[PDB]
C-alpha cells in the first residue's frame, strides 16, 4: 500500500488550500490518516487526523477552528484544508497512515505536497547570458553560464543545447529575494579551447507563467 | 515550540554509538509509547522504532529505543554517515487528545574530510545593463562543513546593501553549494574600478574579483 499526494500549490495571503491523499494498492480499512507538516528550517508539527469508517477526526489545538479533514470511502481518498492562510503556512504537508498493533504508529507516508504562501504574483523569468572567464588557466577551462533571474513561483528547468550538454553543468538552488521573486544560476565547466567553435545554448522553461526562453551565451566582446 | 523536547543537535563519531534524548510529561510519554521517526527533507519521514523500543521489518539492528518514567531515548550503534538525517520522538498526549513530536535533533557523523570551496564571480552582462539593473553572480561550491560566511567589497570598500545569500545546500558528491547576489545599479558598476566576493570557511578565505568591459 502507498499514500500519493496531490501536486504543489501556490496560494496568496487569506486564501484556503486543500490538498489530496490517495490510498494506492489498497484502502483507508479501519485505519487512521494523520497529517503532519514541516515549514522550511523547522520540525514535523501534527494538524490532525481522521479515522474515515468512523468519521471521528482529532485536531491539533495550534490550529484553532483552520484545519478540516475529510475523506470518501468510495474513491480511497482523504482530504487537508487549511483556511486563512499566512506566510508561516509554506511549508510540505505530508499524509500517513496509522498502524493500530504498532501502538498507531505513521508506518506509510505520502510524498509530501509543498504549499508556498505568498503575495508574489507569477512572472516568468528574465534570462541573461553569463559570458565565458577563466577558471583554470593551467586545466585550459573556462565557466560561462545563464542568470534566471527574477521569477515566481518555483520551479524552472535548465537544459544545456537541448538536452545534448550535461558534463560539466551546475544548476544552482535559486534565491529568494526580498522582493518576493527569485533567481537561479547555471554554470557549465567547458575547455577554452572549445569557445571559438561550440555553440552554447541555456534553454529555460517556467510552467507556472508558461515561459519557454533560449539564450545564446557566446565569448565576450 | 514543541511538547516533546529533543536537543536540536548530535554527532557521533562512524563505527561508534550516539543517543538522542526525548522529554516529556506524565501525559504523553509518561502514560503512551513513542515512536521514533528518521528524516532528510525532500523525502517523507521513515519510521524507525514503534511501541518504545520495536523495529519495523527493514530498520537494521543498530537501532534501539528504550522509555523510562517521562523520557524515552534513541540509540544508534555502529554509526554510519548514511545516518546523517533528522530524528523525532513521538507520542500520544492524553491531556492534548493528539499527537505530539519533539522538535528533533539533527545528527552529524563525524567522519567526512574538509574541502575548500570554489568561487565564481560573474560580472553583469551587457543585456542585463541594456535593462538597467546590474547583478554580480557568486557561485560558491564543493565546501565542507556545510558553512560560510560571504562578503562583498566595492575596489576595496565594504558593501553591505543589495546583498542576497542562500543558505549551503547538500550537492550529490555530499559536499555543499552556496550563491550570493550582489545587485546594483549601472552607475555604481561603472564608477568603481572593480567588484570582490570574499568567501571564508574555517577562517581562511578564496576572493574572486570582476571589473567593468570598456
Known amino acids: 500500500v502507498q499514500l500519493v499526494q496531490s501536486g504543489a500549490e501556490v496560494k496568496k495571503p487569506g486564501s484556503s488550500v486543500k490538498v489530496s491523499c490517495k490510498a494506492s494498492g489498497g484502502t483507508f480499512s479501519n485505519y487512521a490518516i494523520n497529517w503532519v507538516r514541516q515549514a522550511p528550517g523547522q520540525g514535523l508539527e501534527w494538524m490532525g487526523g481522521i479515522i474515515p469508517i468512523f468519521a471521528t477526526t482529532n485536531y491539533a489545538q495550534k490550529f484553532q477552528g483552520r484545519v478540516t479533514i475529510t475523506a470518501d470511502e468510495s474513491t480511497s481518498t482523504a482530504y487537508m484544508e487549511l483556511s486563512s492562510l499566512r506566510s508561516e503556512d509554506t511549508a510540505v504537508y505530508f499524509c500517513?497512515?496509522?498502524?493500530?498493533?504498532?501502538?498507531?504508529?505513521?508506518?506509510?507516508w505520502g510524498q509530501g505536497t509543498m504549499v508556498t504562501v505568498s503575495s508574489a504574483s507569477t512572472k516568468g523569468p528574465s534570462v541573461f547570458p553569463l559570458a565565458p572567464s577563466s577558471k583554470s588557466t593551467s586545466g585550459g577551462t573556462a565557466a560561462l553560464g545563464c542568470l534566471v533571474k527574477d521569477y515566481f513561483p518555483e520551479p524552472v528547468t535548465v537544459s544545456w543545447n537541448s538536452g545534448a550538454l550535461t558534463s560539466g553543468v551546475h544548476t544552482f538552488p535559486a534565491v529568494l529575494q526580498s522582493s518576493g521573486l527569485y533567481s537561479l544560476s547555471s554554470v557549465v565547466t567547458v575547455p577554452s579551447s572549445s569557445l571559438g567553435t561550440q555553440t552554447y545554448i541555456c534553454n529555460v522553461n517556467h510552467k507556472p507563467s508558461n515561459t519557454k526562453v533560449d539564450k545564446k551565451v557566446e565569448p565576450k566582446s | 515550540q514543541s511538547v516533546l523536547t529533543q536537543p536540536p543537535s548530535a554527532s557521533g563519531t562512524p563505527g561508534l554509538r550516539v543517543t538522542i534524548s526525548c522529554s516529556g510529561s506524565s501525559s504523553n510519554i509518561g502514560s503512551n509509547t513513542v515512536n521514533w521517526y528518521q528524516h532528510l527533507p525532500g523525502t517523507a519521514p521513515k519510521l524507525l522504532i514503534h511501541?518504545?523500543?520495536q523495529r519495523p521489518s527493514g530498520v537494521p539492528d543498530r537501532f534501539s529505543g528504550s522509555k523510562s518514567g517521562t523520557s524515552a531515548s534513541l540509540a544508534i550503534s555502529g554509526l554510519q554517515s548514511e545516518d546523517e538525517a533528522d530524528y523525532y520522538c513521538?507520542?500520544?498526549?492524553?491531556?492534548?487528545?493528539?499527537?505530539?513530536f519533539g522538535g528533533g535533533t539533527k545528527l552529524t557523523v563525524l567522519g567526512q574530510p574538509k574541502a575548500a570551496p570554489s568561487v565564481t564571480l560573474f560580472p553583469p552582462s551587457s543585456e542585463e545593463l541594456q535593462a538597467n539593473k546590474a547583478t554580480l553572480v557568486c557561485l560558491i561550491s564543493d565546501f565542507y562543513p556545510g558553512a560560510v560566511t560571504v562578503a562583498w567589497k566595492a575596489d576595496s570598500s565594504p558593501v553591505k546593501a543589495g546583498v542576497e545569500t542562500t543558505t549551503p545546500s547538500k550537492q550529490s558528491n555530499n559536499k555543499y553549494a552556496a550563491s550570493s547576489y550582489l545587485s546594483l545599479t549601472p552607475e555604481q558598476w561603472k564608477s568603481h574600478r572593480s567588484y570582490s566576493c570574499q568567501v571564508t570557511h574555517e577562517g581562511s578565505t578564496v576572493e574572486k574579483t570582476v571589473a567593468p568591459t570598456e
Open positions: 511501541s518504545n523500543n
Open positions: 500517513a497512515r496509522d498502524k493500530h498493533s504498532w501502538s498507531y504508529a505513521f508506518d506509510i
Open positions: 513521538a507520542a500520544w498526549d492524553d491531556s492534548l487528545n493528539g499527537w505530539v
